[PDB]
UniProtKB/Swiss-Prot annotation, chains A, B:
The gene is CS. It is found in: Mitochondrion matrix. It comes from the Eukaryota. This is Citrate synthase, mitochondrial. Keywords: Acetylation, Methylation, Mitochondrion, Transferase, Transit peptide, Tricarboxylic acid cycle, Ubl conjugation. The modification N6,N6,N6-trimethyllysine is found at K366. Signal peptide: none annotated. Key enzyme of the Krebs tricarboxylic acid cycle which catalyzes the synthesis of citrate from acetyl coenzyme A and oxaloacetate. GO terms for cellular component: extracellular exosome; mitochondrial matrix; mitochondrion; nucleus.
Length: 434, 434
C-alpha cells in the first residue's frame, strides 16, 4: 500500500512477461544498421540499450514513464504549502510507472530520513579532503567509500539467487539516495562554510528540505527551487554519459555505490556536466560589459558580434531536441513568479526574446532554443548559491533518482553484462574489404 | 629518440590522415545490424567502438598492436637477469605500435620512477580507510582523489586547443601509471601488514620491481611473475567493461584519473574482475572434498557431478574467446617452469586435461577452454599472496596500461562523446510496429 518494495515486487513479474513476449515475437528483428562512421562517432544514432525510466519525446521534451514535465508539475505531490513537485514523487513514478498519492510520498520522505546516516569513515574522509579537490571528485570518492555499506555486494558474496538481486539493489539505492544530501552538504560546508557541521536530519521533512537545511539555507523559495531542480534533472534517457556509465558498470553487478560513483566521474566531464557553469560565466561577463539597463537593440548587437567571431551563445542549441526544453520553461515560470525584478534573471529573459535569432542563419547547429542549463545558474546565484564549482554536485544528486530507479529495473529484468565488440582501424579496413 | 612523447607526436598525424580518408571512402559502409535481442542482451555481438591498442581473435586470443602474447614474450625487453617481458615495453608497444628497444624501455622505467610521488592528502586518505573497505574501493577512491593533480583538467578549464588534448592526457596518464604501484602497495600494507610503510622508490629499478619491493616481496620469481602478470592483463579490446567504462567516461573529456577510477568500479563488478577469487575458492573447496592427490577418474567424477547439479566450473568459457586463452597458457608455462610440484597447480593442470573433455561431451558450452582467471590465483597464493580480496587490485594496475594507452589515442584522434540512443520497451515496441 505504502511499501514501495512490495508494490515493486508485484509489478516485476508483469514487466518480465511483457519483455519475454516481445523478445519472443521480435528478438531477431532488425532495428538499425551499424556503419563505420557510427563506430568512429561515439555510437551516434545507434540504438544500443534498453532504458525504461525516461524517453525523449521530440515534440514535448523528456517524458518520465510517459509523463511530460508539465504533467509532472500538475500531478506529482507538492510539499504542503508548496507549488513544486517533490523529487520523492518523481522517484516513485520512475520506479512504479504510477503517480504516487500524497501518503506514498510521505512514506518515501520518512524512509529516506531514516536511512540518511553517514558512516564515520566517510565523514572523516570528507573532513580530510583539501580545498583544491573538485567537489565532484569529493562526491565520487565518498560514494565509492560508502560501498562498505553495500547490502548487495555482501549478499552476492554469499551466493544469493539471481531472482533476488533487485531487492538488495533496491535497498542499497534507497540507502544511497538518503545519504547523498548528507555527503553533498558536507562537501559544500567543508569547501565554502569553513567546515561547519551539517546538523541533523528531521524525520518529518522532505528530502529537498533536509538537503537545503544541511547546506545552511533557510529560504522557502530556495527549497522550492531545489524541489523543482532535483525533479527535472532526475533522468534523461539511458544514452547520456552518466546514465550509460551507471548502466554499464551496473551490468557487471557492481553495487549501486560503485555504479553511481562511476556515473559521477562521467558527469564530471566538461562535455557532460559543465554547461550550467559556462552559461553563468558568460551571463556575468555580459551583464558587467553592457550594464543591467541594456536595451534589446544593443543586446541584439552584442549577440551578433559574439556569433560573428564563431563564438557560441552558451545554452542555446543542443544534441537532440526541437523546441524550448520544457526544463527551461519550468525555471522561467518559477523566476517570473518569484524573482521578476532580479537583474540577471531579466537578462536571461531578455536573451530568450532575442537570441533565437536563427542558428539556421548558419545551418551548422540544429536548434535555436535554450536548453535546461541556460536558466539554472541565475536561479542558484539569486538564492546565494554562488560557488559554481559545486553546481554539478546538485545535478549529480538529481541524476541519482533516475539512474538508480533504472538500476533496480535492470537487475529485476536480468539485463546481462554490457559487452559490445570493438575493432581497430586496421581491423575495420580489413573487414570492409572482406 | 627515447622521448615517447616526441615519437608519439610524429605518429599521430599519419594516423589522423589514414582515418580521415578511410571515413571519407567508407564511413557509410554497413558493418553489422542491430536486433531487438542485442539491445536487451547488452550489445552482445554488436560492433560498437573503435579501439586501437588490442584486438581479440575469438580464435588465437588477444593481440597487442598485431602481436600475440607468445610473440611479445620473445620480443619485449626483459629485466637484466630475467626472462619475463617488462610491462614498460608492453605500454610502449600499445602507444606506438612498435616494439621498444632496451634503451626505450630503460628510459620509460626511469620516467615512471620520477613521477611516482603521492600528494599528502592521498597518503592520508589511504591511511585512514577502515579494514572493511574493500581494496578495489580504496583503489578507486584514491585514484579519484589524485585528480587534484590533473594537468588535463586545469588546461581544459583555461581553454587549450583540442589539437593539444592528447599531450595533457599523456602527461596525466604517465603520472597515474607511475603512482598506481604506490597506491596499490599502500592499500596492501595498510590492510594486510598492519600499516607498515611502503619504503622508497629506487630510481634505477623497473616499475614491477619497485612495486613488489613496496608490497614487501623480495622473491625474484615473484617479481618475474608480477612482470608477466602486469604485461598480460594489460589490455583485452575495448568491449570489456573496464576498457569500455574508461572509454565512455574519457569521451566526456574527464581526465585519466576520473576515467581510470570509473573503470575500476567496473572492474570491481563480480562479472568482470572477481573470477580469479571464484576460481581459487572453488579449487580449495574441491581439494578438501576429493583430497590432495586425486586420480583423473575421481576428478572427472566431481566435474560431472558439478555439471549435473546445474553448477558451473569457474575459469572455463568467455564472452568472445572460443579457444584456450593465451593468457592461461602463459601462466601454465610459468608454472611448469617454477612450481611444477605445487599441489594446487597440479590440480589446475589436471583440470585442463579433464574439464575441456567433459564440457563438450555435455555440449552446453560454446567455449570449453579455460580463460586467464582459471590459472592466476594458484600462482599468487604460491608466493605468499593469499589475500584474495586484493587480487583484482593487481588486475587493475595492469589494465591501466591498456586503457590509458588507448585514452591517449582517443583524444589524439578526436573521438567524440559516446552517446548511443536508448529506448524503452514500450518505445521499442512502437518503433518496431511502425
Ligand atoms: C564467461 C561466461 C560468463 C560467458 O557466458 P555467455 O557468453 O553468456 O554464455 P555461453 O555462450 O557460454 O552460454 C552457453 C551455456 O553454457 C554455459 N557455460 C559456459 N561456460 C560454462 C562453464 N565453465 N561451466 C558451466 N556452464 C558453462 C552458460 O552459462 C550457458 O548456459 P545456459 O545457456 O544454459 O544459460 C561463462 O562462460 C562463465 O560462466 N564462465 C565462468 C566464470 C569465468 O570464468 N569468468 C571469467 C571470464 S570474464
Ligand atoms: O542528455 C542531454 O541532452 C542533457 C544532459 O546532459 C542530461 O540531462 O543528461
Amino acid at each position: 500500500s505504502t511499501n514501495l518494495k512490495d508494490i515493486l515486487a508485484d509489478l516485476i513479474p508483469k514487466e518480465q512477461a511483457r519483455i519475454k513476449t516481445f523478445r519472443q515475437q521480435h528478438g531477431k528483428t532488425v532495428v538499425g544498421q551499424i556503419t563505420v562512421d557510427m563506430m568512429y562517432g561515439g555510437m551516434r544514432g545507434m540504438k544500443g540499450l534498453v532504458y525504461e525510466t525516461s524517453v525523449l519525446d521530440p515534440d514535448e521534451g523528456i517524458r518520465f514513464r510517459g509523463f511530460s514535465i508539465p504533467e509532472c508539475q500538475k500531478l506529482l505531490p507538492k510539499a504542503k504549502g508548496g507549488e513544486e513537485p517533490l523529487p520523492e514523487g518523481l522517484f516513485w513514478l520512475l520506479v512504479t510507472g504510477h503517480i504516487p498519492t500524497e501518503e506514498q510520498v510521505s512514506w518515501l520522505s520518512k524512509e529516506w530520513a531514516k536511512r540518511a546516516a553517514l558512516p564515520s569513515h566517510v565523514v572523516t574522509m570528507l573532513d580530510n579532503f583539501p580545498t583544491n579537490l573538485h567537489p565532484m571528485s569529493q562526491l565520487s570518492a565518498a560514494v565509492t567509500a560508502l560501498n562498505s555499506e553495500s547490502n548487495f555486494a555482501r549478499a552476492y558474496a554469499q551466493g544469493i539467487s539471481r531472482t533476488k538481486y533487485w531487492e538488495l539493489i533496491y535497498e542499497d539505492s534507497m540507502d544511497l539516495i538518503a545519504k547523498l544530501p548528507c555527503v553533498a552538504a558536507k562537501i559544500y560546508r567543508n569547501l565554502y562554510r569553513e567546515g561547519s557541521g551539517i546538523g541533523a536530519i528531521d524525520s518529518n521533512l522532505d528530502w529537498s528540505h533536509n538537503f537545503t537545511n544541511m547546506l545552511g539555507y533557510t529560504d522557502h523559495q530556495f527549497t522550492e527551487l531545489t524541489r523543482l531542480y532535483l525533479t527535472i534533472h532526475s533522468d534523461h534517457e539511458g544514452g547520456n554519459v552518466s546514465a550509460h556509465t551507471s548502466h554499464l558498470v551496473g551490468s557487471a553487478l557492481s553495487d549501486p555505490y560503485l555504479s553511481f560513483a562511476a556515473a559521477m566521474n562521467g558527469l564530471a566531464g566538461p562535455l557532460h556536466g559543465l554547461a550550467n557553469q559556462e552559461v553563468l560565466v558568460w551571463l556575468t561577463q555580459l551583464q558587467k560589459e553592457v550594464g543591467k539597463d541594456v536595451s534589446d537593440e544593443k543586446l541584439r548587437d552584442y549577440i551578433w558580434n559574439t556569433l560573428n567571431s564563431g563564438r557560441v551563445v552558451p545554452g542555446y542549441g543542443h544534441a537532440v531536441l526541437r523546441k524550448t526544453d520544457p526544463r527551461y520553461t519550468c525555471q522561467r515560470e518559477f523566476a517570473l513568479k518569484h524573482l521578476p525584478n532580479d537583474p540577471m534573471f531579466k537578462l536571461v529573459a531578455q536573451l530568450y526574446k532575442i537570441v533565437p535569432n536563427v542558428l539556421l542563419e548558419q545551418g551548422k547547429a540544429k536548434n535555436p532554443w535554450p536548453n535546461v542549463d541556460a536558466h539554472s545558474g541565475v536561479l542558484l546565484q539569486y538564492y546565494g548559491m554562488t560557488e559554481m564549482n559545486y553546481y554539478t554536485v546538485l545535478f549529480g544528486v538529481s541524476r541519482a533518482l533516475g539512474v538508480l530507479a533504472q538500476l533496480i529495473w535492470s537487475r529485476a529484468l536480468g539485463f546481462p553484462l554490457e559487452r559490445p565488440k570493438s575493432m581497430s582501424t586496421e581491423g575495420l579496413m580489413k573487414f570492409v574489404d572482406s
